[PDB]
Design a binder for this molecule. Sequence first.
Ligand code: CA
Ligand code: CA
Ligand code: CA
Lengths: 164, 132, 29, 132, 112
Amino acid sequence: FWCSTLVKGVIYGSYSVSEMFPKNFTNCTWTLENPDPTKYSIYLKFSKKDLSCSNFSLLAYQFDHFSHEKIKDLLRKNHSIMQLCNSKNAFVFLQYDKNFIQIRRVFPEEDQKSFFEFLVLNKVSPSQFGCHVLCTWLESCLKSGRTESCGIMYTKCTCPQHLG
Amino acid sequence: VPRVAFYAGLKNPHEGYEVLKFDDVVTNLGNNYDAASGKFTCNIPGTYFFTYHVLMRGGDGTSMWADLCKNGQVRASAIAQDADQNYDYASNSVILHLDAGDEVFIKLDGGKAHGGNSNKYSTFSGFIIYSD
Amino acid sequence: GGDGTSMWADLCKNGQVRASAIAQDADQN
Amino acid sequence: VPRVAFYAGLKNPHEGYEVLKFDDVVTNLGNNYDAASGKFTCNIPGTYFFTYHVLMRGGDGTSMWADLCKNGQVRASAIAQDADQNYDYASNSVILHLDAGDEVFIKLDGGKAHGGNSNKYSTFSGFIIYSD
Amino acid sequence: VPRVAFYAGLKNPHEGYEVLKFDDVVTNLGNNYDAASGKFTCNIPGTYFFTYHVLMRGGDGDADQNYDYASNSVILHLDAGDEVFIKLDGGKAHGGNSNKYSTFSGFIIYSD
Ligand SMILES: [Ca+2]
Ligand SMILES: [Ca+2]
Ligand SMILES: [Ca+2]
C-alpha cells in the first residue's frame, strides 16, 4: 500500500529531502541496503540546514530483515529510531553497520535546499575516493564552528590533509 | 534415473532455538526442499549426502551450535567459538539413509546466525546417491 | 591482544558470485 | 554397478600421533570401514570422495594438526588453531583415485582431538563416484 | 556418462584481488581444469558439486600467523562454456609447497 524506494549497488549517493518523496504519499519511506554487512559500513550525513520536520516529520530506523513498511508498522521495534531534525547541531552525522537503514517521511526551493548523502567503506582497505569523501565530511564537521568532536572513525584511512 | 538435488542459501538472521529456514534457493531438482519449510522431505527412499555451513553473527555471542537433524533425532552437530566476536563457521557434512517420508533440517541449538541477504554465506546443499 | 586479520574468498560463475567464505580471526598475541 | 558409501562419527577422544578410531558408524553400505583399525580398505578401484571434520579439544591444546593419508602419503591436511583454547573445526574434503586394496585414514599430527560420544561432532564420511 | 572430476591444492601464496589458481592438481579426470589457470571450464553441461577450503595466514604485533579456514560447498547448474573459479576478494591465503592445505575439488553429479 505504501511507497518505498531501495538504493543498492551504490558506493555513494546524494538526494535532497524531496529527491526521495515524489509520489507525495504521506508515510512514504526510503530504504538503503548495505552491500556486505561484514566488509562495508554505512556513514550518512543530512544537512538540517532545512527543517524537513518543519514541513514534515522525519525519522530513521535500522533493520536486518527486509521490510518496506512493516518494520515501521510496529515502529515500537524502536530500533535506535533517530528523529532527523531534533539536531542541536547544523549537521547531523550518524553511522550504521546493520543490514538495512530506513528513513520514514510521515505526515502526522527547500525541497532542493536540504540534502542527504551516504557512503560505504571497506573497514579494511578503504578507497581513496571514498577516503576523500570521508575527508570532506570530517573537515566540514569538526567545524559546522566547534572543532571539538567529530568521531567519524576512519581507521585505515586518515586524511592526507590535516590528519596524522 | 532419479534426479534429486537441492541447494539453498540462508537469507534472514535466525537466533535462538528455532529451525533455520534457508530461502535463497539456487538449485532445486525434483522440488523436494521447500525454502519456506526450510526442510527436506524425502519421497524417494535411498541414501543422501547433506552438507551445511552456518555463519556465526559477528559482534554478538561467542558460541554457535548448528545441528542437522533428520526427523526428531539429531544426527549431526557443529560448534563455532571465537572469544573476540569474530566470524567462524559451524559446518558439517553427513551421509544419511533416508527411507520414504523422512524430514531433515538444520536446527539451531542457541546462538545467532548471520543474516546474509544474497551473498550466500550460510549454505545448505544435498543430493541423493543411491535408490533403495 | 587485539589486531584483526579477515579474508573474503569468492567463487563466481562468469563473474556472478556463487559462493562466499569469510575467515576472521585474531590470535591474541 | 558398485555401490559403496560410509559415514562414521567419532566417539572417544584421541591424542598424539595416531589413527583416529571412528566408531559411531551411522551408514555403512558395502562395509569397507573397520572401526577397529580406523581404515577404509578399498576393495573396488575407482574414484572416491572423502570429507572429514575434527573438533579441537576445548581447554587443552591450542593447535592440532590433522592429515588424511592414503597408504603412507599425506594427501590432505588441516590445522585448527585458537589461542583462547576454544573449539575450532579442522575440516577438509578430497577426491582421490584409490587403487585396489589401499587404505585411507585420518592421522592426528599433534594436538588433542575432541569427540562427542553421540553429539556426532567430528565426522568422517566418504563414497565412491566412479568405478574403474 | 560424463566422466568429469578434479581436485587440486595450492602451492604459491596469493594476494590482492587476483583469482586463486590452484596448481597442484592431484586428480584432473576429464582434463577440464587447468592447474596453472586454477579455473574450470564446463565442457559437459549439468549439475556439478563444488567445494573449496582456504587457509588464511596473517597477523601483527610478539608476532604470530593467524590460521583459520574459509570454506564452502555448493551445487551449480553449469552449461556449455561456463567458467568456475575461486577469486580471493581480499586478505591472505597460506600456501603449502607440498603440504596441501588449501583445496578446491569438484565433480559432476548429473548430465544434462
Ligand atoms: Ca576461530
Ligand atoms: Ca562477496
Ligand atoms: Ca574455523
